[PDB]
Amino acid sequence: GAMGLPNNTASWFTALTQHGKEDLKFPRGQGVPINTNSSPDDQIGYYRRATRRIRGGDGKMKDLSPRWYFYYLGTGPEAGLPYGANKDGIIWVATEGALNTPKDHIGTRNPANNAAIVLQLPQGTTLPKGFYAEGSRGGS
RNA sequence: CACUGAC
RNA sequence: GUCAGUG
């Protein structure tokens, strides 16, 4: 059969770097950042834990901390991940006003032309102890 | 994560 | 954000 899927799918926001023992788990109704780029019904997706480790010949690896990128529901022409699907490094997040349906309309952007916004949480929502904001410090 | 160069 | 390389 054929292999090699040229799928980019860049996140409009940053990721979530974890520095602890646990992975990531958001409560029902939380986990959705301030997506000013999407509509209220688009406030539903999942987090994907990715890593960037350069594979060198000598063995030199850049080594980057595990970060969970924010992906909207239906991000990928051949993702095959319905709301609720349990996958490694994949957690679903939904809020009030979001409907169950793929919305790949916001799951596309040129990463080498358009940057991403710092993933921030709304009022009454704080990040779990162990995670930090990528590109933002609590005070600076 | 630390440092540089680039879109 | 993303690519190349090094610490």
Curated annotation (Swiss-Prot):
Changing residue 69 to A: Significant decrease of RNA binding capacity. This is Nucleoprotein. Belongs to the betacoronavirus nucleocapsid protein family. The gene is N. Residues 4-140 are annotated as: RNA-binding. Residues 23-43 are annotated as: Disordered. Changing residue 96 to D: In strain: Omicron/BQ.1.1. ADP-ribosylated. The ADP-ribosylation is retained in the virion during infection. Phosphorylated on serine residues by host GSK3A and GSK3B. This promotes the solubility of homodimers that would otherwise aggregate. Host phosphatase would dephosphorylate the protein during assembly at M bound membranes. The chain holds residues 44 to 180 of 419 of the full protein. Changing residue 123 to A: Partial loss of RNA-binding. It comes from Severe acute respiratory syndrome coronavirus 2 (2019-nCoV).
